Design a protein around this ligand. Sequence first.
Ligand SMILES: CC(C)n1ncnc1-c1cn2c(n1)-c1ccc(O[C@@H](C)C(N)=O)cc1OCC2
Length: 879
Amino acid sequence: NREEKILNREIGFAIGMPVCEFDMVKDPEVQDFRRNILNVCKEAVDLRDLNSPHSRAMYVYPPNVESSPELPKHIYNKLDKGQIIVVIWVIVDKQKYTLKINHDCVPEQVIAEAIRKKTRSMGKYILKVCGCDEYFLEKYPLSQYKYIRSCIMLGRMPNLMLMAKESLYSQLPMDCFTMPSYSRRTSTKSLWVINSALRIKILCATYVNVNIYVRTGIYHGGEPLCDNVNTQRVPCSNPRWNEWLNYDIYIPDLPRAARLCLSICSVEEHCPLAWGNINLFDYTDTLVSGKMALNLWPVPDLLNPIGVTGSNPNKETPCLELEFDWFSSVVKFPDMSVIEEHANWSVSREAGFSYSHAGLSNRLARDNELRENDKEQLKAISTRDPLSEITEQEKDFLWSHRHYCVTIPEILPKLLLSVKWNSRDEVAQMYCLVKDWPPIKPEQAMELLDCNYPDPMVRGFAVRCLEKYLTDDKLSQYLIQLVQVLKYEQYLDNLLVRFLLKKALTNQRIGHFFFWHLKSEMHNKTVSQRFGLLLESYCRACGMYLKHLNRQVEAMEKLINLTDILKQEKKDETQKVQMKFLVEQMRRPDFMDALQGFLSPLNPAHQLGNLRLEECRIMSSAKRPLWLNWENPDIMSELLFQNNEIIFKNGDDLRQDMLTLQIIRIMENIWQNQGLDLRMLPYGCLSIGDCVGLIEVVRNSHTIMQIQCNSHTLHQWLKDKNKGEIYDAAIDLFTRSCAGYCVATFILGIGDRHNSNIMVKDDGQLFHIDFGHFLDHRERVPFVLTQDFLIVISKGAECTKTREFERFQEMCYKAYLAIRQHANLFINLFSMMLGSGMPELQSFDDIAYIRKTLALDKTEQEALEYFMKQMNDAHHGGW
Ligand SMILES: CC(C)n1ncnc1-c1cn2c(n1)-c1ccc(O[C@@H](C)C(N)=O)cc1OCC2
């Protein structure tokens, strides 16, 4: 209890709300979640204690490693006959030892050769990256570590520090995981034996304050299971309906994930005033019964089935009182034994159907009447993108051939949307198909966790595909989306949240961003309880890292508080006076300690040492962000970077930039693996709160305006920065990077480019900043190549009619079609992000912008001609 109280304060500080507020929640789902989730906490801690010293180090310092050991061919060509030159430092004074060695060498082999060269100068060691807290604790090939592959790709010398194993292990403390205090804690009839249609009683509304009627519907995801039913019209002075609304569904046919969606509307031009959604079955599989009160949400269509389920935690809001049916017994959803037997009964009955019986329905087909054309038709349908319309004929067709669909596993999402979810006979059969369904790729499985797929059997299958096949690399890459799709889950306790929590608690690189993605949305009352309770479970079992997270939370909090004062109190004051106030307030003993000596939330391998106050400044950009500079206190910081530079911005939504930078990284990965070296720059960006976040500074980079402050000025600047033999590499890097950003920005519909949001590095690497908006915010061309860009592309020249420009065009075409081939991934990544509150990504029609820019209905050659035409019209010729 004494140690628990201190831990409760630590967790309360981390999550931004006290633990006691969870204790006072009456809802038994909340209290069951808190108790039952501790299984995952226990399991994770055991894996860390299994092989205790090394396995604890593996948790804290996991290998930053690529998914595949196999190297792309053009990256292998950068090596000297498949060998890499590596520098290994030994602190005795620092002593370097340059080794020329095979790229696929194991760290232990690399350590041995360093000792041999040290012996020429006359398993107890581990390799560390010089300048940051990144270690090579696992037996991978050296080239698979992301630091080395980055070094090979960029043509940089890898600098590693030889360190004693016991020096690392002694730093890692043993955290004893303790279970909390809350650990120690008519008839029943089946759904299918209730011969009755669905009825729901709407009683009355309270807190209906204005200067009406209740619309309702029953939904499986975004799909209606029957017609919407309205109450009779009533004046807002007395909202008391007391009507039994009758729905066209048999109760036995209600799917597991069935939801009552409702709204109070005003009356023609109808308009929603407030909305609310309810699960028709609770977390214990029990059908909702008796009286209930639902506090509604403000409108951001008359109903909102995409919106989150459950009551508004704000109780000073419109509150509809509801009553459900009574059957003199506790109604529960049937077990899988009952479902399997019913499916088996249906399959055998259908297999007995005659020619004429099967002829009654297009959803029924005979077993020995599957021709070669219809098999290839199913294959053709499966290749189509997620936003492509599946007609009712195709749905009937897909379902009738569902047993053949098992042989083409990737078609599952199409088949699932073809199912009649208001028919227990079909759903029961679909459950048995999903149960034994073969594994699909993690990227394909991710689609089945978005808002179109609410069924727990379907989502369980998706989670199992991730458990079996999703690497830690790709989990880290897609964590943003996987956190978002938790919002679509019916219940607090589910297979997805258990999978993500276990990975967060067995991989501290994952756990770090897991914490911050959840923490960043704790202001949002749509997800505050779920994320708060999930964060509690994480903090209770993450070990020593809670204390390091609390350093980061306090550092951010003091930066939030400081920037709030400057944009409220000292709004209209000069830069000199604001800076004097800033430096004085930061130099306060409590502030100064809080704002230095912690890990970067952008990358927890980076230690932020002492602040360089003289290097810090208030920027002239929108919302006046802070430019912050810390010393890197790493002993070999000079070999990576001496100073860590971060932009702290308080005022603007940084989630759009975060998503774009992630997508840019994924686009770059596709191009690099395909074998076209178009270097992008997806710099770090992290939303930490409500319109608050961090941005990674790229060193030695300048905006186009800063270069200029003639058309040849930009090309002349790169000449001066890259004189002699380096010049050709700089122009090449510029052309290749410019080509990637041209293609990326057009596809995504990024905000209009200009001289202040395009940047160029000294070496020639072009990139974009401040994305802000994407998609349909007819298809625009954000990055118009002015003559400045074309002149440098053409090496100073009629820059349109040159071989350098024709080369540049071919890079753009190859890059365009490469992304077209991976269109489903990007559509799915955007679809998983619809639950987020980004205003430009609210519906599937917003995502349909990518369908247009990638020209998916059109052919591959027609897609190039479309892309060429957009570039031609934007630039007024050339393409
Ligand atoms: C406008 C800004 C606050 N912003 N808004 C949304 N994204 C950015 C944003 C993103 N980056 C930057 N800014 C950035 C700026 C300045 C900079 O160097 C200084 C010396 C300069 N050129 O004056 C280096 C930089 O690194 C690239 C990443």
